[PDB]
Amino acid sequence: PLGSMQIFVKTLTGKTITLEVEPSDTIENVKAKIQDKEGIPPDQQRLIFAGKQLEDGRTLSDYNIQKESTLHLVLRLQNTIERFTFPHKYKKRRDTDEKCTICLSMLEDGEDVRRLPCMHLFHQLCVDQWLAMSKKCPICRVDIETQ
Amino acid sequence: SMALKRIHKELNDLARDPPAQSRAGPVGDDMFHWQATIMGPNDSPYQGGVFFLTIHFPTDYPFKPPKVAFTTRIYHPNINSNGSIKLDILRSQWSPALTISKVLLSISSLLSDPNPDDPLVPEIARIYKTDREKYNRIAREWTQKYAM
């Protein structure tokens, strides 16, 4: 949206999203800007800067964010899977077509879906079986117990 | 039930998108038993040669790795005379995000990048780790007498 300047966010895998923002941008607007670039709802995102997690209803300058500042992106919050992972049902945007690397079928609206702290996406049934024997991510080899 | 569907989907993508210098497919009506061809790495002594491989899909696929073995005889520190390939991604570094075409291309990458320090056939390792010049000659003769 051609913000007054730019900032970066880093996921657990080290992937870096560049955002255009103005110091007068609310944090819920920053989450949505990330939604338009990777497809993560603000519902799922949790942002961390300078040791504190950013609450929905404040501004970037309240947390005193600079130019070239870096945010950190983690997930908001057999049964240990549900303790480290975010389940939801997929919602298709509109390359923005995603597929489950385990069953190799594309992802559809209404399908029960899983997202790991590395910010990767799979079907719920497919990755729940794989995590029952490895606890790591099939795409980037990141443990779901990573914090 | 749970595994055959991926083998079906991998196969369709293999037909529409034939991999880079690698062909594979099932034998007869046995969807868990495939054959495969592999081309030579470009700089390695196996360059230009074609290598045949047997692959067996376990029932737990893709949650467990596929069993892959050479049938053409190849001279390599990590590949014995029985065609066995000890390769971490085929054992414990296995990921269900690896399709056969990407598993096969991983194997060709192993030919161009041997590892003598953790070997399978140590006799081949010592020859490599003392005079690669003589190793490359022998490996080139093996890939020319069996794979050309």
Place this chain on the structure above:
Amino acid sequence: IFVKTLTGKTITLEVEPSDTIENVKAKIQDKEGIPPDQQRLIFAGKQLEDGRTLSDYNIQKESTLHLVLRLRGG
């Protein structure tokens, strides 16, 4: 240049012949979410090491690189 990723989606990359392989892996990290520790690049069956540049392999425009997880011959 092009890259066949683990999701099968061939993705375009804008690099010049002076770029090292570690540069290319980093660009893939930003568009894929896979650290350069776990990235193995392959062109014409051969692996590409982090030290040399794209021109050292004489990789020219519109070439297609492939991406697999990091291996370890054992």
